[PDB]
Design a protein around this ligand. Structure first.
Ligand SMILES: CCCCCCCCCCCCCCCCCC(=O)OC[C@H](CO[C@@H]1O[C@H](CO[C@H]2O[C@H](CO)[C@H](O)[C@H](O)[C@H]2O)[C@H](O)[C@H](O)[C@H]1O)OC(=O)CCCCCCCCCCCCCCCCC
Ligand SMILES: CCCCCCCCCCCCCCCCCC(=O)OC[C@H](CO[C@@H]1O[C@H](CO[C@H]2O[C@H](CO)[C@H](O)[C@H](O)[C@H]2O)[C@H](O)[C@H](O)[C@H]1O)OC(=O)CCCCCCCCCCCCCCCCC
Ligand code: CLA
Ligand code: CLA
Ligand code: CLA
Ligand code: CLA
Ligand code: CLA
Ligand SMILES: CC1=C(/C=C/C(C)=C/C=C/C(C)=C/C=C/C=C(C)/C=C/C=C(C)/C=C/C2=C(C)CCCC2(C)C)C(C)(C)CCC1
Ligand SMILES: CC1=C(/C=C/C(C)=C/C=C/C(C)=C/C=C/C=C(C)/C=C/C=C(C)/C=C/C2=C(C)CCCC2(C)C)C(C)(C)CCC1
Ligand SMILES: CC1=C(/C=C/C(C)=C/C=C/C(C)=C/C=C/C=C(C)/C=C/C=C(C)/C=C/C2=C(C)CCCC2(C)C)C(C)(C)CCC1
Ligand SMILES: CCCCCCCCCCCCO[C@@H]1O[C@H](CO)[C@@H](O[C@H]2O[C@H](CO)[C@@H](O)[C@H](O)[C@H]2O)[C@H](O)[C@H]1O
Ligand SMILES: CCCCCCCS[C@@H]1O[C@H](CO)[C@@H](O)[C@H](O)[C@H]1O
Ligand SMILES: [Cl-]
Ligand SMILES: [Cl-]
Ligand SMILES: [Fe+2]
Ligand SMILES: [Mg+2]
Ligand SMILES: [Mg+2]
Lengths: 451, 30, 342, 36, 334, 37, 37, 34, 62, 31
C-alpha cells in the first residue's frame, strides 16, 4: 500500500479520493469504474422500466423517465406517441447493461491491478496536471468524442428513422428531418434570447429542424475545437487567468455541470418539444391552460358566450388580454399565456386565441387532450399521491417532469457548492495556504491597521 | 414473487462484503 | 463525618461511564419514563376515545403521524393519575383516557429539572462556572409555558400540544388560525433568537475553520490540534480583519463572542415563552385596530395583514369541527367561508 | 424610457467590463504568499 | 504603473476599510440600487396589483401600513415571468401599479448577494485564509434564491415570489403550507433540525466556553477584560469544558478537538439550511410534503383520521380562502 | 413487460437498479476493514 | 473471547440488519394498515 | 479483570431490551391487514 | 432452442456472479496469481461467447 | 405621525451603522 493512509497521503479517509490526484493509473481506474456505474444504471433502470411497463397506459402514469428518452428519439412509438414496439427499449437496456460489465472490468483492473501511475509506462497516457499542452490535448480528444455524439443525434434524425415530433402536421408522429436549420442567425439567435417570460433562451426551441441543425453546428464546433486544442497550447492571457492543477480543473467542470443541471431543470419544466408531453406529461403551464380550455368548452356547450363573460374581478372569466393585447385564457392561468402546444395552436390566430375558432372549431380530440392534461398536472406528494396537497389518497401520480426538475435542481445546486469548495481550495493550494496560516508569517500582521 | 426478489437481493448484497472477507482472510491487498 | 450520607455521596459521584450524582435520582427515572411513555404510546396506544384519531404504529400510523395525544376536553386539567378518580387504577382505561399524556408531560417536567440539576452538580464537581445550566433555563421556559401554562389557561389539557410530529404541526397551524401567533412580537423575538443563533453557530464554526493556523503537514487539518495546547488554533486577528472589511464590524473579544452565543438563542426562547403565556389567556397580538377601522370603512383598502386574517378565518372554520370534536360543530356547507371556485 | 434604457445598458456594460478585465488582470498573483 | 494598474491595485487592496474587490465592483452598485429602491418603495409606493386581478394591495407606510404590515409587493400575475424593467412601462405610474419595484429590487439584490458571496472568497484569498466562509454563506443565499427566484420560476410568476415585508412573509408561508404541505416535507424538517440545532449548539458552545474561562479578572470587573485582542494563549480551558460535557452525557459524546467541534458548528446549520433551501426549490416544481390523507382505514372501509387529516383540514381552510377573487376554475394548478 | 422468454429473470431485473447504491456502501465496508486509516 | 469477531464484520451485519428492518417498515407503508387501500 | 455488571450495564439494557422487543412488535404490525 | 437459450442465459448470470466476486479477489491476492490470470482470461472469453449466444438465440425464442 | 416615527427610528438605525463601522473602538493588538 502506497499513499493509502492519512500519514503518507496527508488526506483522511473521508477525503480518501484526494489520494488519487497524482496517481494517474488508479485515477483512470476510478473514472472508468464510475462510467461503468452510469452505464449500469442506464441499462438496469431501462430493463426495470420495461418490466413494469404497461403499453396502453401513458408513460407518465408509470414513473418512467428513461423510456420517454428512448421514445423521443423515434424508437418504439407511432402516431400520437402510441407504443408500437417495446423491443427497442429492451435493446437499449441490454446493451447498456452488457457494456457496463466491460467498463467495470477496465475500472476494477486499473484501480487495483494495473500500473498505479501511467507516466513511466506511457508518454501518451501519462500526464502532469501542470502540463498545459497535454491537458488541452486530452480536452481535445473529448471534444471530438462529444462532437461525434452530437452528430449521432443528427444521424438518427436525418438518416435512421427520424425523431418523435409532437408538432407533426395532422398530429404527433415520428418524422425524418430532411431540412435542418443551418442559418447561424437562427441557431445562434437562440443563445442571445432573454431567459425571461415569453422568450425563454434556448429552452424556447419549438421545432425539430432547429434542434437538428443546432447539433450539426455543435458537432462541427466541438470537432473543430478539439482539433484546435490538440494542435495548440494555452495563450499567455489564458495562462495568467487560470489556476493549473487537477483540483482547479475539477472545479471548472463542477461549475459547468451546475450550470447545465439548472438548464436541464428549466428544459424539462417548460419545453414540450424535446420533452414531448405524450411521454413526459403536460408542463405546469400546459395543464393550467388545459383547465381553462376544459371549462371554456364545457360552459360554451352549456350555452355560455365565453367572449363576453365577465368574471368576478371584471376581467373575462374565460378570455382576457395579455399586457400587449393578445387574447389569452383568463383566471390565474393569465400567467401562462406564453404556453404553446399542438392541441391549442389550432385555436390561435394573429391576435391570439380566436373567438370564431373557439365557438366553431374545437374538436373532440382537443377536448380529450385538455382533460387529460388538466388531470395530469405536475403536482403531487413525495409518496406519489397525485394532485394538490389537500387531495385524498387514490391517484398514484407524480409527473416525470417534477421528478426530473427537482432531482436536477438538487444536483445542480450541490454541484455549485462543490465548485465553490474546489475552486476556493485550488486557489488556496496553488498559493500555498490551504493547510492554514503560517504562525511566523501571518499576512495580516504585516498589513497596516484599518483604523 | 417477493421471495425470489429477496433471494436475488440477498445474494447480490452479500457479494460485496464477501469480496472483502475473502481478501481479509487471504491477507490481500486491501 | 463519613456517615451513611457521605458514603452514599461517594457512590453517587463515582467517575463512571454514565455519571449519576444526587440529581440522577430525579433525572434518570423521570427521563426514562417520559421517553418510555412516548415510545409505548406511539407504538401501541390509540387516541380514538379522546380525539377520534388513530395515533400508533399498531393502528397503521407511521413515524410522522404517531402521537401520544392529549386527554379529552371533558377531562379539564385533571392530573389524570393512574389511581385517580377517572381511571381508578385501571391501566387500560387510563391509556384510553389520555393518561399517558399527563404521565409524559409531568415526568418530562421533573426530568428537565433533574437534567438542569445535573448541569449544576457536574459543574460544581468539575469546578467550572454553571453557564450551561443557566442556558438550559430557555428550554425549560419553553417546555413549561407551552406544555403546562398554555393548556392551564385554556379549557383543558386537550389544547396542549400532543406528543407527535404531525400533532405538533397541527399545533403550529392552530396557533396561526386562532392566535395569529406569527403577528406576535414575542414570537418574532423568538424567531430572531433561533435564526440568529443558527447564524452565529454557522458563522463562528466557519470562521474558526477558515482562519486556522497551519500546525501540521496534513491537508486534513483536524489532527493538528492538541487539547492541552496553550496556543489558539485559529487567528483572531485575521478573523477580525476579514469581517471588519466584509461586514463592517467584527468580534475582537473572544469572551464576548462566546457569551453572545449563549445570550442570543437563550433570550429568544425566553421571549417566545412570554408570548405563549399571553396566548394561554387568548391575550393575542391578533389585530391592528387602525387597520380594521380603515378596512371596514374602505372596501378598497387591502394589506398583507388583511389577507392573512382571511386565511385564519378559513383555518378556523375548516379545521374546528374535527379538531374540536367535543364542541359537536356542524357547519353546513353554505356557512363555510370560501373564495371563488375553490 | 428609451434614454433610461440606453443609460442603464451603458452603466451595466461598464461595470461588467470592469469585473471581467479586473479578474483577467493577473488575479492569481494577488495573494500574500506564492504569487502564481 | 498606469491608470488601470493603479485602479486594479486599489480595487483589490487589503488596506481598504471595507474591501472592494472585483465582486465588489458589481456588489456595490447593485446593493445600493436595491436598497435605495426598497426604502423609497416601503415608505411611498402606491398599491400594487399582485394577483393581476385589478385588486391593488397596499404595501407602503404612507398608504396605511405600519412596519409589521408593510411590504414591497410582488409584481403582477399578468406579467408572470416576463422581464419588467422601468423602460418597459409606458410610465412610472404604470410601473408602480404593476409592481415594478419588486423586480428591480430582487434582481439587484440577488446579484449583489451572489457577489457578496464571491467577495467573501476573494478577501479570504487576499488575506491568506482558507476559503470556505463563502460556502457557509451559500446556505442563506440559496434560501433567498429559493423564495425570490426558483419558486416563481416553478410556479410561472413573480407574483408568487415572497413579498418584501413582515406580514407578506407570513402570507407566503401559509399559502405555501396550503399548496405543498411543507411541514410534512422532510427537507423542511431537516431545515428545522438545522435551525433548532444551530440555536441549540450556539447556546451550547457559548455556555461551555464561558463556563471554562480562565480567571484573569477581579470580582468588580467584566471577565471579558480577561481576554486581550490578538493574545497568543487560549482564553478558556477546553479540557475542563470537555471534562464537564463528557460527564453531562458521556465521554465520547463530547468534543476534545476544537477544530472538529467548530467544523460541526459550521456543518450542522449549513447543511440543514441547504436542505431547507432545497425544500423550497423542489416544492417549486410541486414535489410536495408527504400526503397521508385517509391513509388509515378500518375493516369496513371507514376513514380513521390521524393528525395528518387534521393538518389537512387546516390546509383546506388556507386553500379555499387564499386569493379569494383570483380563481375561476376548480383546481389551483399553479 | 419483458419479452416472455425472459420472464423467469424478472425478479432479478426488479433488483438490479439498486446495485449502484451498494457500491457506495461497499466503500464503507472496505474502509472499516482497513480501520479507516 | 474479546477480539475474535472483527469489528468491521459486526458493523456491516448490524448495519444490514437496520436496512432490512427499516426496509420492512417502508414496505408496510404500501400494504395492510396505513396503506390507504 | 473487568467487571461485567455495572451502572453502564443497567443503563444499556434499560434501553436495549425494550427497543428489540418493540422492533419485533412493529415488525409484526407490518403484516396486519384491515 | 428455448432450453438452449434458457441455460445459456442462466450460465451467463452464474458466470457473471462468479466473476463479480472472483476478479477483484484475484486481482488483490498475493499467491495463485498465475493460476488466477488464465481463469480470468477463460472467464472473460466464455462470458463474451455467452453474451453473443444469448444475443443470437434471442430471435429464435422471441 | 406614525410614518414619521417609523422612518425616524429607521434613520437612527442607519446612522448607528455608520458610527459603529467608521467610528468604532479600533481593535488593538496586545497580550
Ligand atoms: C456563468 C455565470 C452567469 C452569471 C450571469 C448572470 C446574469 C444572467 C443570468 C440570468 C439568471 C436567470 C434568470 C431567469 C430565470 C428564468 O426565468 O428561467 C426560465 C427559463 C425558461 O423560460 C421559459 O421558457 C419558456 C419556453 O417555452 C416555450 O416554448 C416551448 C417549446 O416546446 C413550449 O412550447 C412552451 O409552452 C413555450 O412557452 C417560455 O418562454 C416561458 O415564458 C419562459 O418563462 O429557463 C432558461 O432560460 C434557462 C436558464 C436557467 C437558469 C435557472 C436559474 C438558476 C440560477 C439560480 C441558482 C441558485 C444560486 C444559489 C447561490 C448559492
Ligand atoms: C418554573 C419552572 C419550575 C419547573 C416546573 C415544575 C413542574 C411541577 C408540576 C406542577 C403541576 C401543577 C398542575 C396544575 C394543575 C391545575 O392547576 O389544574 C387546574 C385547577 C382548576 O381546575 C379547573 O377549574 C376550572 C374552573 O372551575 C370552577 O368554575 C366552574 C365554572 O364556573 C365550576 O363552578 C367549577 O366547579 C369550579 O371549580 C374548570 O373546572 C376546569 O375544568 C378545571 O380543570 O387548579 C388547580 O388545581 C390549582 C390552582 C391553583 C394553583 C396554581 C399553581 C400552579 C399553576 C400556575 C399556572 C397558572 C395558569 C394560568 C395561565 C396563565
Ligand atoms: C465511485 C466510487 C468510488 C471509486 C470508483 C473509487 C476509487 C478508488 N478509490 Mg475511493 N472512496 C469512495 C468512492 C470511490 N472510490 C468513498 C465513498 C469513500 C469513503 C468511504 C472512499 C475512500 C477511499 C480511500 C481512503 C481510498 C480510496 C482509494 C481508491 C482507489 C484504490 C482502491 C483500493 O486500493 O482498493 C482496495 C480494495 C480492494 C482490493 C477490495 C476490492 C475492491 C474492488 C475494486 C471491488 C470491485 C467489486 C466489483 C463488483 C467487481 C466487478 C468485476 C467485474 C466487472 C468482473 C480507487 C481508484 C485509495 C487510494 O486512493 O489509493 C492510493 C484510498 O486510500 N477511496
Ligand atoms: C436523476 C435521478 C432520478 C430521478 C429523477 C428518478 C425518478 C424516479 N424514479 Mg429512479 N433511480 C435513481 C435515480 C432517479 N430516479 C437511482 C440513483 C436509483 C438507484 C437506487 C433509481 C432506481 C429506482 C427504482 C427501483 C424505482 C425508481 C422509481 C422512480 C420514480 C419514483 C421515485 C420515487 O418514488 O422516489 C421517492 C423519493 C425518495 C426515495 C427521496 C430521495 C432522497 C435522496 C436520497 C435525497 C438526495 C439529496 C442529495 C443528493 C444528498 C446529498 C447530501 C449533501 C449534503 C452532500 C421516479 C420517476 C420507481 C418507479 O416508479 O419505477 C418505474 C422505482 O420503483 N428509481
Ligand atoms: C477511457 C478509458 C481508458 C483509457 C484512457 C485506457 C488506457 C490504457 N489502458 Mg485501459 N481499459 C479500459 C479503459 C481505458 N484504458 C476498458 C473499458 C477496459 C476493458 C476492456 C480496459 C482494460 C485494459 C487492460 C487489460 C489493459 C489496459 C491497458 C491500458 C494502457 C494501454 C492501452 C493501449 O495501448 O491501447 C492501444 C489501442 C488499442 C488496443 C485500440 C483501442 C480499441 C478501442 C477499444 C476501440 C474503440 C474506441 C472507442 C473510442 C471506445 C468507445 C467506448 C465508449 C462508448 C465508452 C493505457 C494506459 C494496459 C495496461 O495498463 O498495461 C499495463 C492493459 O493491460 N486496459
Ligand atoms: C469543454 C469545452 C472547452 C474547454 C474547457 C475549453 C478550454 C479552453 N479554451 Mg477552448 N474551444 C472549445 C471548447 C473548450 N475550450 C470549442 C468547442 C472551440 C471551437 C469554437 C474552442 C476554441 C477556443 C479558442 C479560439 C481559444 C480557446 C481557448 C481556451 C482556454 C481559455 C478559454 C477561456 O478563457 O474561456 C473563458 C472565456 C472568456 C475569458 C471570454 C469572455 C467571457 C465571457 C464573459 C463569457 C460570456 C458567456 C457568459 C458565461 C454567460 C452567457 C451564457 C452563454 C452560455 C451564452 C482554455 C484552455 C483559448 C486558448 O488559449 O487557445 C489555445 C483560445 O484562444 N478555445
Ligand atoms: C424520582 C422519581 C420519580 C418522580 C419524581 C415521579 C413523579 C410522579 N409520578 Mg412517577 N414512577 C417512578 C418514579 C418517579 N415518579 C418509578 C420508578 C415508576 C415505576 C414504578 C413510576 C411509575 C408511575 C406511574 C404509573 C404514575 C406515576 C405518576 C407520577 C406523578 C404523581 C406521583 C404522586 O402523586 O405520588 C405521591 C407520593 C409521593 C409524593 C411520595 C411521598 C413521600 C413522602 C415524603 C413520605 C410520606 C409517605 C408515607 C411514608 C406513607 C404513609 C401513607 C399512609 C398514611 C397510607 C408524578 C409526576 C402518575 C402520573 O404520571 O399520572 C399522570 C402515575 O400514574 N409514576
Ligand atoms: C474502484 C473501487 C470501487 C469501485 C468499483 C466499481 C464502481 C465498479 C464496478 C462495476 C461494475 C460497473 C460492474 C458491473 C457489472 C455488470 C455485470 C456483471 C453485468 C451483467 C449483466 C448480465 C448478466 C445480464 C443479463 C441479462 C440479459 C442478457 C438480458 C435480460 C436479462 C438479464 C438482465 C438477466 C469501490 C467503490 C468499491 C471502492 C474501492 C475501489
Ligand atoms: C448486472 C448483474 C449482476 C451484477 C452484480 C453486481 C455488480 C453486484 C454487486 C455488488 C455489490 C457492489 C455489493 C455490495 C454491497 C454491499 C453492502 C451490503 C454494504 C454495506 C454496508 C454497510 C451495512 C455498512 C455499514 C457500516 C460500516 C461497515 C462501517 C461504519 C458504520 C456502518 C454502520 C455505516 C449479477 C452478477 C447479479 C448478474 C445479473 C446482472
Ligand atoms: C409507560 C409506562 C411505563 C414504562 C415504560 C417504559 C419504560 C417503556 C419503554 C420503552 C422503550 C424504551 C422502547 C423502545 C423503543 C424503541 C424503538 C421503537 C426504536 C426504534 C428505532 C428505530 C426504528 C430506529 C431508526 C432510525 C433512527 C432513529 C435514526 C437514523 C436511522 C434509523 C432509520 C435507523 C410503566 C410500566 C412504568 C408504568 C406505566 C406506563
Ligand atoms: C466577445 C468576447 C470574445 C472573447 C475573446 C477572448 C479574448 C480574451 C482577452 C484577453 C486579454 C486580457 O489580457 C490581460 O489584460 C490585462 C490588462 O491589460 C493584463 O495586464 C495586467 O498584467 C498584470 C498581470 O499579472 C497585472 O498585475 C496588471 O494589473 C495588469 O496590467 C494581463 O496581463 C493580460 O493577460
Ligand atoms: C436522603 C436525605 C438526606 C438527609 C440528610 C440527613 C442526614 S442525618 C445524619 O446522618 C449522619 C450520617 O450520614 C448520622 O451520623 C447522623 O446521626 C444523622 O443525624
Ligand atoms: Cl392570500
Ligand atoms: Cl383559475
Ligand atoms: Fe468557539
Ligand atoms: Mg416482477
Ligand atoms: Mg401497513
Amino acid at each position: 500500500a502506497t499513499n493509502r493512509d492519512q500519514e503518507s497521503s496527508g488526506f483522511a479517509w473521508w477525503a480518501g479520493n484526494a489520494r488519487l490526484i497524482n496517481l494517474s493509473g488508479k485515477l483512470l481506474g476510478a473514472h472508468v469504474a464510475h462510467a461503468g456505474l452510469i452505464v449500469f444504471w442506464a441499462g438496469a433502470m431501462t430493463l426495470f422500466e420495461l418490466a413494469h411497463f404497461i403499453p396502453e397506459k401513458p408513460m407518465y402514469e408509470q414513473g418512467l423517465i428513461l423510456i420517454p428518452h428512448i421514445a423521443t428519439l423515434g424508437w418504439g412509438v407511432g402516431p400520437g406517441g402510441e407504443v408500437v414496439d417495446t423491443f427497442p427499449f429492451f435493446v437499449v437496456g441490454v446493451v447498456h447493461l452488457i457494456s457496463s460489465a466491460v467498463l467495470g472490468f477496465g475500472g476494477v483492473y486499473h484501480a487495483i491491478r494495473g500500473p498505479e501511475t501511467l507516466e513511466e509506462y506511457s508518454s501518451f497516457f501519462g500526464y502532469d496536471w501542470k502540463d498545459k499542452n497535454k491537458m488541452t490535448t486530452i480536452l481535445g480528444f473529448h471534444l471530438i468524442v462529444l462532437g461525434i455524439g452530437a452528430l449521432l443525434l443528427v444521424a438518427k434524425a436525418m438518416f435512421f428513422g427520424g425523431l418523435y415530433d409532437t408538432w407533426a402536421p395532422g398530429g404527433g408522429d415520428v418524422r425524418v428531418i430532411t431540412n435542418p436549420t443551418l442559418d447561424p442567425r437562427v441557431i445562434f439567435g437562440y443563445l442571445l434570447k432573454s431567459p425571461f417570460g415569453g422568450e425563454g433562451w434556448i429552452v424556447s426551441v419549438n421545432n425539430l429542424e432547429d434542434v437538428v441543425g443546432g447539433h450539426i453546428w455543435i458537432g462541427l464546433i466541438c470537432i473543430a475545437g478539439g482539433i484546435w486544442h490538440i494542435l495548440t497550447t494555452p495563450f499567455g492571457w489564458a495562462r495568467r487567468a487560470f489556476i493549473w492543477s487537477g483540483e482547479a480543473y475539477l472545479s471548472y467542470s463542477l461549475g459547468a455541470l451546475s450550470m447545465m443541471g439548472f438548464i436541464a431543470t428549466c428544459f424539462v419544466w417548460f419545453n414540450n418539444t424535446v420533452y414531448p408531453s405524450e411521454f413526459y406529461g403536460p408542463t405546469g403551464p400546459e395543464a393550467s391552460q388545459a383547465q381553462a380550455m376544459t371549462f371554456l368548452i364545457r360552459d360554451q356547450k352549456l350555452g355560455a358566450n365565453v367572449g363576453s363573460a365577465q368574471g368576478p374581478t371584471g376581467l373575462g372569466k374565460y378570455l382576457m388580454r395579455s399586457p400587449t393585447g393578445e387574447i389569452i385564457f383568463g383566471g390565474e392561468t393569465m400567467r401562462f399565456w406564453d404556453f404553446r402546444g399542438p392541441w391549442l395552436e389550432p385555436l390561435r390566430g394573429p391576435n391570439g386565441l380566436d373567438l370564431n375558432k373557439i365557438k366553431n372549431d374545437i374538436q373532440p380530440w382537443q377536448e380529450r387532450r385538455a382533460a387529460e392534461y388538466m388531470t395530469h398536472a405536475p403536482l403531487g406528494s413525495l409518496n406519489s399521491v397525485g394532485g394538490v396537497a389537500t387531495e385524498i389518497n387514490s391517484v398514484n401520480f407524480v409527473s416525470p417532469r417534477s421528478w426530473l426538475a427537482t432531482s436536477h435542481f438538487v444536483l445542480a445546486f450541490f454541484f455549485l457548492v462543490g465548485h465553490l469548495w474546489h475552486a476556493g481550495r485550488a486557489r488556496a493550494a496553488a498559493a500555498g495556504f490551504e493547510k492554514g496560516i503560517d504562525r511566523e508569517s501571518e499576512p495580516v500582521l504585516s498589513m497596516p491597521s484599518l483604523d | 414473487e417477493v421471495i425470489a426478489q429477496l433471494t436475488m437481493i440477498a445474494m447480490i448484497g452479500i457479494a460485496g462484503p464477501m469480496i472483502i472477507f475473502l481478501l481479509a482472510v487471504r491477507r490481500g491487498n486491501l | 463525618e463519613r456517615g451513611w450520607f457521605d458514603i452514599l455521596d461517594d457512590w453517587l459521584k463515582r467517575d463512571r461511564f454514565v455519571f449519576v450524582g444526587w440529581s440522577g435520582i430525579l433525572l434518570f427515572p423521570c427521563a426514562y419514563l417520559a421517553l418510555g411513555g412516548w415510545l409505548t404510546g406511539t407504538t401501541f396506544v390509540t387516541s380514538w376515545y379522546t380525539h377520534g384519531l388513530a395515533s400508533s404504529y399498531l393502528e397503521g400510523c407511521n413515524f410522522l403521524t404517531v402521537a401520544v395525544s392529549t386527554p379529552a376536553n371533558s377531562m379539564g386539567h385533571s392530573l389524570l393519575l393512574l389511581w385517580g378518580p377517572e381511571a381508578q387504577g385501571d391501566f387500560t382505561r387510563w391509556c384510553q383516557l389520555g393518561g399517558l399524556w399527563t404521565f409524559i408531560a409531568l415526568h418530562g417536567a421533573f426530568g428537565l429539572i433533574g437534567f438542569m440539576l445535573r448541569q449544576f452538580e457536574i459543574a460544581r464537581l468539575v469546578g467550572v462556572r454553571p453557564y450551561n445550566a443557566i442556558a438550559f433555563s430557555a428550554p425549560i421556559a419553553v417546555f413549561v409555558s407551552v406544555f403546562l401554562i398554555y393548556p392551564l389557561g385554556q379549557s383543558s389539557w386537550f389544547f396542549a400540544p400532543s406528543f407527535g410530529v404531525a400533532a405538533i404541526f397541527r399545533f403550529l397551524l392552530f396557533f396561526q388560525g386562532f392566535h395569529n401567533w406569527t403577528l406576535n412580537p414575542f414570537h418574532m423575538m423568538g424567531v430572531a433568537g433561533v435564526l440568529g443563533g443558527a447564524l452565529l453557530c454557522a458563522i463562528h464554526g466557519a470562521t474558526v475553520e477558515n482562519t486556522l493556523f497551519q500546525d501540521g503537514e496534513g491537508a486534513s487539518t483536524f489532527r493538528a490540534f492538541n487539547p492541552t495546547q496553550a496556543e489558539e488554533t485559529y487567528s483572531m486577528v485575521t478573523a477580525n480583519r476579514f469581517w471588519s472589511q466584509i461586514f463592517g464590524i467584527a468580534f475582537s473579544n473572544k469572551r464576548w463572542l462566546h457569551f453572545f452565543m449563549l445570550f442570543v438563542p437563550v433570550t429568544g426562547l425566553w421571549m417566545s415563552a412570554i408570548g405563549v403565556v399571553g396566548l394561554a389567556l387568548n391575550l393575542r397580538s391578533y389585530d391592528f385596530i387602525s387597520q380594521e377601522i380603515r378596512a371596514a370603512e374602505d372596501p378598497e383598502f387591502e394589506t398583507f395583514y388583511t389577507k392573512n386574517l382571511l386565511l385564519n378565518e378559513g383555518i378556523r372554520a375548516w379545521m374546528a369541527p374535527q379538531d374540536q370534536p367535543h364542541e359537536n360543530f356542524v357547519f353546513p356547507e353554505e356557512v363555510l367561508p370560501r373564495g371563488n371556485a375553490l | 424610457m428609451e434614454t433610461l434604457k440606453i443609460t442603464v445598458y451603458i452603466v451595466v456594460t461598464f461595470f461588467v467590463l470592469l469585473f471581467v478585465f479586473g479578474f483577467l488582470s493577473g488575479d492569481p498573483a494577488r495573494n500574500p504568499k506564492r504569487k502564481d | 504603473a498606469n491608470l488601470w494598474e493603479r485602479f486594479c491595485n486599489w480595487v483589490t487592496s487589503t488596506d481598504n476599510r471595507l474591501y472592494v474587490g472585483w465582486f465588489g465592483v458589481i456588489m456595490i452598485p447593485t446593493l445600493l440600487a436595491a436598497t435605495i429602491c426598497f426604502v423609497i418603495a416601503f415608505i411611498a409606493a402606491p398599491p400594487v396589483d399582485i394577483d393581476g386581478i385589478r385588486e391593488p394591495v397596499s404595501g407602503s407606510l404612507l398608504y396605511g401600513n405600519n412596519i409589521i404590515t408593510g411590504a414591497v409587493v410582488p409584481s403582477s400575475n399578468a406579467i408572470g415571468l416576463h422581464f419588467y424593467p422601468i423602460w418597459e412601462a409606458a410610465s412610472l405610474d404604470e410601473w408602480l401599479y404593476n409592481g415594478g419595484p419588486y423586480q428591480l429590487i430582487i434582481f439587484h439584490f440577488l446579484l449583489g448577494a451572489s457577489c457578496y458571496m464571491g467577495r467573501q472568497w476573494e478577501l479570504s484569498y487576499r488575506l491568506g485564509m482558507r476559503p470556505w466562509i463563502c460556502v457557509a454563506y451559500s446556505a442563506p443565499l440559496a434560501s433567498a434564491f429559493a423564495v425570490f427566484l426558483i419558486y416563481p420560476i416553478g410556479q410561472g410568476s413573480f407574483s408568487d415570489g415572497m413579498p418584501l415585508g413582515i406580514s407578506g412573509t407570513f402570507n407566503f408561508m401559509i399559502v405555501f403550507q396550503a399548496e405543498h404541505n411543507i411541514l410534512m416535507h422532510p427537507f423542511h424538517q431537516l431545515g428545522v433540525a438545522g435551525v433548532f440545532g444551530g440555536a441549540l449548539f450556539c447556546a451550547m458552545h457559548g455556555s461551555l466556553v464561558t463556563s471554562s474561562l480562565i480567571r484573569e479578572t477581579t470580582e468588580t470587573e467584566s471577565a471579558n477584560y480577561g481576554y486581550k485582542f490578538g493574545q497568543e494563549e487560549e482564553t478558556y480551558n477546553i479540557v475542563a469544558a470537555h471534562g464537564y460535557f463528557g460527564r453531562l452525557i458521556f465521554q465520547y459524546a463530547s468534543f476534545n478537538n476544537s477544530r472538529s467541534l467548530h467544523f460541526f458548528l459550521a456543518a450542522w446549520p449549513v447543511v440543514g439550511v441547504w436542505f431547507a433551501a432545497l425544500g423550497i426549490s423542489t416544492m417549486a416544481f410541486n414535489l410536495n410534503g408527504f400526503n397521508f390523507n385517509h391513509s388509515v382505514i378500518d375493516a369496513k372501509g371507514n376513514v380513521i383520521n390521524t393528525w395528518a387529516d387534521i393538518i389537512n383540514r387546516a390546509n383546506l381552510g388556507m386553500e379555499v380562502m387564499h386569493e379569494r377573487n383570483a380563481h375561476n376554475f376548480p383546481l389551483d394548478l399553479a | 413487460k419483458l419479452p416472455e422468454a425472459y420472464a423467469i429473470f424478472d425478479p432479478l431485473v426488479d433488483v438490479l437498479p439498486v446495485i449502484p447504491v451498494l457500491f457506495l456502501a461497499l466503500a464503507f465496508v472496505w474502509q472499516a476493514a482497513v480501520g479507516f486509516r | 473471547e474479546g477480539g475474535r469477531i472483527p469489528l468491521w464484520i459486526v458493523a456491516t451485519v448490524a448495519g444490514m440488519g437496520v436496512i432490512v428492518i427499516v426496509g420492512l417498515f417502508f414496505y408496510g407503508a404500501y400494504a395492510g394498515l396505513g396503506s390507504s387501500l | 479483570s473487568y467487571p461485567i455488571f455495572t451502572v453502564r450495564w443497567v443503563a444499556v439494557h434499560t434501553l436495549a431490551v425494550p427497543t428489540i422487543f418493540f422492533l419485533g412488535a412493529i415488525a409484526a404490525m407490518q403484516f396486519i391487514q384491515r | 432452442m428455448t432450453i438452449l437459450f434458457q441455460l445459456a442465459l442462466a450460465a451467463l448470470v452464474i458466470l457473471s456472479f462468479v466473476m463479480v466476486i472472483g476478479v477483484p479477489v484475484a486481482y488483490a491476492s498475493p499467491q495463485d496469481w498465475d493460476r488466477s490470470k488464465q481463469l480470468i482470461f477463460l472467464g472473460s472469453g466464455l462470458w463474451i461467447a455467452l453474451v453473443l449466444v444469448v444475443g443470437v438465440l434471442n430471435f429464435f425464442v422471441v | 405621525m406614525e410614518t414619521i416615527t417609523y422612518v425616524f427610528i429607521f434613520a437612527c438605525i442607519i446612522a448607528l451603522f455608520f458610527f459603529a463601522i467608521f467610528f468604532r473602538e479600533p481593535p488593538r493588538i496586545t497580550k
